[PDB]
Structure 1
Amino acid sequence: NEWIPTSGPAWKVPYLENVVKRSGRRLLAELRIASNNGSGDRTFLDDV
C-alpha cells in the first residue's frame, strides 16, 4: 500500500515502437541494381 496502482509503475517499464530503417547491405543492393544498372536489355529493349 506504499505504492498506489493509479500512480503508475515504479519499476523499469519498457516501451517499443516499429521503425522504418533499411539495412546497409539492402541499400547497397538497391544502389547496385537500380542506380548503377547499365545492362543493355533495359537501355535498348525498353520499347517492348
Structure 2
Amino acid sequence: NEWVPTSGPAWKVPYLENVVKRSGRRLLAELRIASNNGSGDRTFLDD
C-alpha cells in the first residue's frame, strides 16, 4: 500500500544489452590467417 505501481520498480532491475566483441583467442587466429598468412598459395596461385 506504500509503493505506487506507476512510480516504477523499488527493487533491483536487471537491464541488458547485446555487444559485439571478439575474444583474444579469436583475434589471434584472425591475425594468423588474414595478416600473418604467408602460405605459398594465396601469394603465387592467386590468378
Give me the whole-angstrom Cα distance separating, in 2, the residues matched to 1:5 and 1:43: 67
Unaligned runs of 5+ in 1: none
Alpha-carbon distance in structure 1 between the residues aligned to 2:14 and 2:37: 44
Deviation sequence 1:1-48 (CA, Å, 0-9, x none): 10000000000000000000110000000001111000011100000x
- Segments of 5+ residues of structure 2 without an aligned counterpart are none
Number of aligned residue pairs: give it: 47
The alignment's TM-score, normalised by the length of structure 2, stands at 0.96
**Counterparts of 1:35 and 1:41 in 2: how far apart (Å)?**
14
Question: Which consecutive segments of 4 or more residues in structure 1 shift more than 6 A?
Answer: none
Q: Percent identity?
A: 98
Query: 2:13, 2:42 → 1: CA distance?
Result: 53
